[PDB]
Amino acid sequence: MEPLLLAWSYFRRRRFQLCADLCTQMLEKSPCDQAAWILKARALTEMVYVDEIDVDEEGIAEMILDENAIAQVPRPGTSLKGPSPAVRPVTQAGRPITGFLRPSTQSGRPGTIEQAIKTPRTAYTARPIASSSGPFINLSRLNLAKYAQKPKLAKALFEYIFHHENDVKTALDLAALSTEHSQYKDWWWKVQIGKCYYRLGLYREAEKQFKSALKQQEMVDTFLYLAKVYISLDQPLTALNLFKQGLDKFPGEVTLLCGIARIYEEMNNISSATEYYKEVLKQDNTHVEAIACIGSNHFYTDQPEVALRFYRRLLQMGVYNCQLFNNLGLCCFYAQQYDMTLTSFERALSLAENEEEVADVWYNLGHVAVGTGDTNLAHQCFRLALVSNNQHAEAYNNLAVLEMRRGHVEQAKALLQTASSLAPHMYEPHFNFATISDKIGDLQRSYAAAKKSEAAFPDHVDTQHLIKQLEQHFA
């Protein structure tokens, strides 16, 4: 009823528009009221809040122009920098496609600025890469030396400056004055200064504050923060020891086990990431990350029924996506459940909020069709995948395979050239182009294509026989 009370109760119920809407009134009515002031600050900063732990873009500049790893060429198995590409689709030379895209995924790194620019913008991150990773209150007007004295105001004000305005320097000024006001005895200000540092670039100066905050009071937050810091310095085996220390503190934490599994998958030894995702399951059993990862791994290691179970679980827990339903369709078809197969693809096509998701669903429908026979339906589905996403290399490759099945060799050659131009990291377009060339002749093009195939999937077999035959023809 009353303004302040109704606004605060709107805040408790996570409205975040009404709260501010009543405080703006209550502030116009009285220029001297700090309760509604910091309440509107909280509402504004929480309409946009996103926890700093899972925000690890890094970007193109950090990837090359910033060197922090001590060892330049460390032993294979101690640095971050399964099914073969003949079964599991790939994204780079290696790095098979993963389940559960998270905005911290790097999934390989480019070598030079030119390569990173001249590639698709979303081939090394979940979002397109960036070079660098009225108003309620004007930051240049308030004296942070006076709000630092009042911690009740200072905490919400720092959260506002950091997560709403993204002013790391003024946030760090406020946090420094606040920490010196608390005589360096509250772990929260230490963690916040460490976050300011970590997104300023100073990792060691942030690891110092995170360690000093762990000494004050163990919290899952500081453990994950140190994990991020250590992963940024390219030190997996330090992060794993720190995670096992945290699990010694918190015996069954799910985020710590999930971080261990993420590190094991970045190092690409799935035989332990599955164990740790299974521990996460034994703890949560609704975890979307572990369920999706174990489901994908179960699907690609020729066990599609277990993957269908793992994805029906996510269906049972109210998850309603385009990805989930296309996955259910692939699993139902390949696990030989032909009644619930195509309705899942229909729900997928219904739920797709993009033009690339629609293209992927049409690609998978073409796979279903070509598994059924009737190559014309798959032809149409691949052409629609192209019509939806012009830069869809798998559709080009499959449509060229079907074209050469029909007989049109030049169409297949052009389409395979387009596919291999869009995705060089794939091996199928190169191998097919080399095969058709060798079939007609042109052993130079066959060599230039089979060598790129071997560069893409270096443990292939038919590529090796092709290269042997070619090098034999050259003498």
Partner: protein
């Protein structure tokens, strides 16, 4: 049905009303003594409603009284000075009212009426925010009430009148208040992230017994005491979930990945542990054994102030109340249902119309595999050219551009026309001149 909250007696509770925490209470305000609880809900729109649900039906709603001022945090406790019978407390923003729901019976299912009498009231100087109730100190058979204020002050009533009132040291936005009986302490969560416990006799003498700097501000704090072996205090933040000891340090904590709205540590099972259930803003309930998820369910609405109670011979029914006005008693769904296409022999694929459309589309496909006039006029004189375009059918999103050569430069390049009715002429005029 697996992992859904299957429905029991459910209802919608008004005309775009609004509730909050403390609204949903669940006890024997009728003082029958049989164990079956009764739902009590009061919005800050004004209406106080009490239900005795049976597994929609008309006679379920015991009463739907309306008070003038809004209602905050209905409670059920021994709020009368004389007897040991449960009374219902209604906290309006600037008012306290203890009632008594007395139900008299008639010789038919719907001949029984229910009378609430205002046992006593209390004018509130400050504006109330929320309250707690308990046997402060070591008293028994009494339920004193400690109400907070929106501006920090906490005022304590000894079940009859205004006992006292002390200001909380250093708080701006009032957080959740609770009272621990195994330590006789008022525990709150100040705006500055400090979970603070004050001994009762310390406040009565007016300071902090202890503090703990959790990472956030808490939405709710629920001190549960049905276990006398190892006491604990639950604190649900807006980003985490702590269970603290009685001295002041974290016994354990969970870093939730969702946004909680309500939680309730209900009756436990194992030795020492405590089952708890938390409600997302993603419409789910989670059932932890203190850190470890034991079950999860997909609720209908965003739960506010869930409760668990024995309603009509069924123990442990979960009663949820949204803030828009919904309300629902429910039981977990434990029926794994075969994933299989429905057998509907009646519903057949209509081959005639579908084949007609497919023949049409395939005809277009196999056929393809085998409106506007523009004119330009140059003046006889930097020569001024004029371009006239005229449409037959109505056209849209028209863009006209001119390209001469590198050296020659135009004074106008692009011209945009929007929709145009049929048989409408459009003229543009630009000038071309040599530059170089």
């Amino acid at each position: 049905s697996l992992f859904k909250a299957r429905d029991w007696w459910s209802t919608v509770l008004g005309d775009k009303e609004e509730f909050d925490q403390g609204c949903l209470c669940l006890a024997d305000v009728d003082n029958t003594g049989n164990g079956q609880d009764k739902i009590i809900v009061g919005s800050f729109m004004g209406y106080l409603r009490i239900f005795n649900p049976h597994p929609a039906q008309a006679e379920d709603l015991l009463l739907e009284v309306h008070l003038r001022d809004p209602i905050l945090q209905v409670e059920v406790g021994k709020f009368v000075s004389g007897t040991e019978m449960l009374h219902l407390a209604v906290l309006h923003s600037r008012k306290l009212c203890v009632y008594s729901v007395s139900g008299t019976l008639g010789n038919v299912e719907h001949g029984n009426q229910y009378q609430i009498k205002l046992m006593y009231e209390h004018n509130l100087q400050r504006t109330a925010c929320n309250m707690t109730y308990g046997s402060f100190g070591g008293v028994k058979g009494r339920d004193l009430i400690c109400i907070q204020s929106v501006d920090g002050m906490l005022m304590v009533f000894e079940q009859e009148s205004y006992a006292f009132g002390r200001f909380l040291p250093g708080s701006l936005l009032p957080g959740p208040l609770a009272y621990s009986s195994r330590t006789d302490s008022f525990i709150t969560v100040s705006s500055c992230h400090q979970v603070e416990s004050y001994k009762y006799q310390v406040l009565a003498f007016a300071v902090v017994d202890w503090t703990l700097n959790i990472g956030e501000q808490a939405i709710d704090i629920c001190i549960v005491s049905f276990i006398q072996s190892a006491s604990s205090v639950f604190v649900l933040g807006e980003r985490n979930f702590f269970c603290l000891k009685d001295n002041g340090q974290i016994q354990f904590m969970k870093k939730l990945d969702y946004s909680p709205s309500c939680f309730l540590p209900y009756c436990s099972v194992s030795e020492g542990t405590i089952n708890t259930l938390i409600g997302n803003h993603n419409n789910m309930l989670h059932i932890y054994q203190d850190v470890t998820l034991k079950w999860a369910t997909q609720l209908p609405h965003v739960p506010v102030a869930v409760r668990v109670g024995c309603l009509h011979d069924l123990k442990g029914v979960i009663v949820t109340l949204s803030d828009d006005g919904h309300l629902q008693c429910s039981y977990l769904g434990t029926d794994p249902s075969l994933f299989q296409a429905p057998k509907v022999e009646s519903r057949e694929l209509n081959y005639d119309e579908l084949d007609m459309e497919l023949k049409e589309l395939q005809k277009v496909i196999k056929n393809v595999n085998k409106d506007l006039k523009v004119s330009a006029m140059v003046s006889p004189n930097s020569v001024t050219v004029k371009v006239t375009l005229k449409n037959r059918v109505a056209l849209q999103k028209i863009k006209l551009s001119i390209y001469v050569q590198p050296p020659l430069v135009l004074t106008g390049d692009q011209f945009t026309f929007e929709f145009m009715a049929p048989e409408m002429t459009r003229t543009v005029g630009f000038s071309v001149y040599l530059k170089g």
